[PDB]
């Protein structure tokens, strides 16, 4: 049953879907975003334009701003990803920091970068972090 999986593969108000994507019907999307492989989007989430989503899962009530990038990440609930901000990781399922994890209602400000780190819930980030565990 792939019809349960989003298979847009175009731009007829549907974004560029690159296989193995589950999109909830309650999401808000922009056709300029490229939703890459292995991404599972939840309900009531606002997806920005020209954003790249591969190898990640996004929870409910997340706000993705202008030109954001998410690689090997897990975005928590009610989280806010600022514009031109990047949240990536290596993808090593054996390393502890191989998959960057964001807590509940974490606000990554504009241009702020998070590379392979773990952020707790209800946290604001004005500065870029790297290879750490932010409480």
């Amino acid at each position: 049953s792939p019809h349960i999986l989003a298979s847009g593969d175009g731009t007829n108000r549907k974004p560029t879907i690159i296989g193995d994507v589950y999109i909830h019907p309650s999401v808000k999307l922009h056709p300029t975003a490229k939703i890459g492989p292995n991404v599972s989007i939840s309900a009531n989430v606002r997806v920005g334009p020209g954003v790249r989503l591969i190898s990640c899962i996004i929870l409910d009530d997340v706000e993705i701003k202008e030109n954001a990038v998410v690689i090997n990440s897990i975005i928590g609930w009610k989280s806010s990803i600022g514009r031109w901000s990047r949240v990536q990781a290596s993808g090593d399922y054996n390393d502890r920091l191989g998959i960057t994890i964001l807590g509940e209602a974490v606000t990554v400000e504009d241009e702020v970068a998070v590379i392979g780190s773990i952020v707790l819930q209800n946290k604001t980030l004005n500065v870029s972090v790297q290879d750490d565990i932010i409480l």
Binding site: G50, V51, R52, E66, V69, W84, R86, Q88, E111
Partner: protein, 355 residues
Amino acid sequence: MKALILVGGFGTRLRPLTLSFPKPLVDFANKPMILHQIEALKAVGVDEVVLAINYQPEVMLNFLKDFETKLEIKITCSQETEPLGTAGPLALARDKLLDGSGEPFFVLNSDVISEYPLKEMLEFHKSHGGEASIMVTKVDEPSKYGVVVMRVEKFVEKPKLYVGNKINAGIYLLNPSVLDKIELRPTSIEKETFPKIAAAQGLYMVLPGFWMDIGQPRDYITGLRLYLDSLRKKSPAKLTSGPHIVGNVLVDETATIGEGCLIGPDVAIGPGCIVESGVRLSRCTVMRGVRIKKHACISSSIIGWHSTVGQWARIENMTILGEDVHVSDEIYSNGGVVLPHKEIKSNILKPEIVM
């Protein structure tokens, strides 16, 4: 009126940008570094300019020949076998500096930037009738530099106690009556020649502008701020403005910018460039012909000639790219000093020199 510019070598400390083009041919804020002081020498009506280089000029003859007609200035080279300190290269070029009228000539360093008020310096020379003139700028760290205790008197290098804060700025103004006091042995103008005229009390200005010693590739982003800042004062209509422009941005007429971008602050895009949509430039400098693809985020970096930044690629933290470097899409670089003619298909997640 004549002039001489001390260049030095090829720019070993400026690699990989000086691996192909020499130090003075590197485009700084759209224009090559050599044109920043040649046009300033035309403001005082200098016809001939000599270069005290150490390498062979055979690689830049096409560049120096194309600037002689555009700027209406005579440009000739002088090549020395060995570096003769700091005042040696001037002893060789004394034949091209004496026109017979006995007028003072300028000596400039290629590793220094400023506002260059050369016009109001001749009046500072033709008023008291001095023999030699240098320029001086205030610095917060006088111990790390050579302090000038001012008419000047003595040279106190690395003063443990405070004797002054004023240091040399690398720009000089010398009468023809000084080209005889030099010896044939390599002599440093800062350690031997200047004290010879200071004890003679036959010399005598404060620099009302910015000063920056460019000796490393990372100083280009912080030195471009001091340049673009002075441009906001001198001529504010030379810096582009708009709804997608923030701060001071110097765009070329040949460069084309896509829609949905955000450029600034302190970004200089060379000619022949094509910037795509969704980009975010800040504190960086873009050289000629390089294409940056869509949705890229570049901050505080240096882009070489005819390179290529893929889509959704993030570049930050003093990442240095050579000529013709192709960054794949979705690639992240955190301070990767990359060699020219290299295809980047993996993330440089930490500072690393790639070949």
